[PDB]
């Protein structure tokens, strides 16, 4: 999977 | 913009080539010139037509031997269509995964990197941020010709700019630390991505940070972890890779410097 969610 | 504003009927649509986050891509024929072109049919979007065209005008001026040219856009009917030059050998990622490694050898890999760095040096000169630099956005032509494509495409769509989810969506393993932190991009974030692209080329198209979960990347990077030298990758190419991954964007080389470095390596290696 290329996309993922990221929370700073 | 009469020189590049087209009508859907100006192009004969053929088979679908694939697609991504922005829309689907089809092989098409620009009737007027019996010219085969690539046609990207963007997803329905909310971006202002005026903003779209102003952005497209900038892209129209991107003219370089290693950058896929924007030929036109169909804007009379939303969602818009983006017409670009057709690249006969598809994307670089698949190309490398399916190529004959005796043919596409160390000198060729070096040649590909040289071309891409030339295209990026040009974008840097124009202060044009690509924002999606990666093997999937490099296209191949005859005789190992490589051209960078879909530069700035993200600025032609609003898409998922806003979501109720926590955090944001990114092609994480190609995203510079500061970009993950602030969801802001620059030429320097493109430099970081160029480093990952070099790794993709050096490995003949492997997925970066193999075995590392996407959610674990940022922390590792913050604590100075960086991908190790790929098998067969020349020490100096890895050196450049590592320079691209400097934590502070300011400490990363410019694309002009990177291109110069590769031109030299390509020259020496030519002999
Ligand atoms: N989040 C992201 O990863 C951004 S990149 P993306 O748009 O989501 O995906 P991407 O792989 O880059 O593909 P795109 O929709 O741009 O489709 C790429 C495929 O379509 C064919 N293609 C695209 N431009 C082409 C040109 N100029 N000439 C020939 N073929 C083209 C390719 O097969 C490519 O894989
Ligand atoms: Mg693309």
């Amino acid at each position: 999977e290329i996309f993922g969610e990221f929370e700073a | 913009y009469d020189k590049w504003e087209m009508e859907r009927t100006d192009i004969t649509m053929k088979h679908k080539l694939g697609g991504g986050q922005y829309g689907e891509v089809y092989e098409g024929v620009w009737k007027k010139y019996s010219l085969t072109v690539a046609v990207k049919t963007l997803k329905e979007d909310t971006m202002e037509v005026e903003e779209f065209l102003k952005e497209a005008a900038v892209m129209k001026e991107i003219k370089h031997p290693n950058l896929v040219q924007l030929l036109g856009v169909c804007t009379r009917e939303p969602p818009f269509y983006i017409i670009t030059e057709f690249m006969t050998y598809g994307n670089l990622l698949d190309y490398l995964r399916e190529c004959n490694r005796q043919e596409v050898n160390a000198v060729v890999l070096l040649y590909m990197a040289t071309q891409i760095s030339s295209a990026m040096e040009y974008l840097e000169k124009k202060n044009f941020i690509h924002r999606d630099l990666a093997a999937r956005n490099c296209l191949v032509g005859e005789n190992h010709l490589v051209k960078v494509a879909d530069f700035g495409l993200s600025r032609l769509m609003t898409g998922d700019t806003y979501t109720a989810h926590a955090g944001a969506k990114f092609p994480i393993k190609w995203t510079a630390p500061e970009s993950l932190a602030y969801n802001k991009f620059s030429i320097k974030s493109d430099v970081w991505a160029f480093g990952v692209l070099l790794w993709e080329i050096a490995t003949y198209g492997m997925s970066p940070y193999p075995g590392i979960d996407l959610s674990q990347v940022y922390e590792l990077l913050e604590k100075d972890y960086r991908m190790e030298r790929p098998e067969g990758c020349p020490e100096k190419v890895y050196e450049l890779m590592r320079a691209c991954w400097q934590w502070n964007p300011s400490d990363r080389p410019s694309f002009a410097e990177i291109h110069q470095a590769f031109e030299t390596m390509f020259q020496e290696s030519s002999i």
Side-chain angles (χ1 to χ4, degrees), chain B residues 21-74:
Chain B
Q21 294 280 309
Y22 310 105
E24 301 169 89
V25 183
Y26 303 77
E27 169 171 339
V29 170
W30 188 351
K31 304 177 180 181
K32 174 179 184 177
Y33 302 98
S34 298
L35 174 76
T36 297
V37 296
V39 183
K40 179 167 290 176
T41 60
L42 301 174
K43 297 175 177 178
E44 308 197 325
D45 186 61
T46 59
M47 189 184 166
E48 261 178 286
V49 188
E50 264 186 51
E51 194 170 304
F52 177 92
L53 289 173
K54 292 185 181 183
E55 193 64 53
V58 179
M59 304 174 155
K60 190 77 185 68
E61 297 312 307
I62 297 301
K63 299 175 178 168
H64 185 278
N66 296 99
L67 281 159
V68 178
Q69 173 179 34
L70 172 59
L71 295 175
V73 304
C74 297

Side-chain angles (χ1 to χ4, degrees), chain B residues 40 136-137 149-150 153:
Chain B
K40 179 167 290 176
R136 53 179 171 277
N137 277 315
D150 296 324
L153 228 192

Side-chain angles (χ1 to χ4, degrees), chain A residues 2-3, chain B residues 17-26 37-40 68 84-91 94 131-132 134 136-137 139 149-150 153 169-171:
Chain A
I2 295 167
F3 292 83
Chain B
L17 303 178
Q21 294 280 309
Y22 310 105
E24 301 169 89
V25 183
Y26 303 77
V37 296
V39 183
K40 179 167 290 176
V68 178
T84 63
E85 112 185 65
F86 186 79
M87 293 298 85
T88 59
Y89 288 75
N91 73 77
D94 293 331
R131 231 234 54 188
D132 288 320
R136 53 179 171 277
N137 277 315
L139 273 24
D150 296 324
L153 228 192
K169 184 183 186 177
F170 308 80

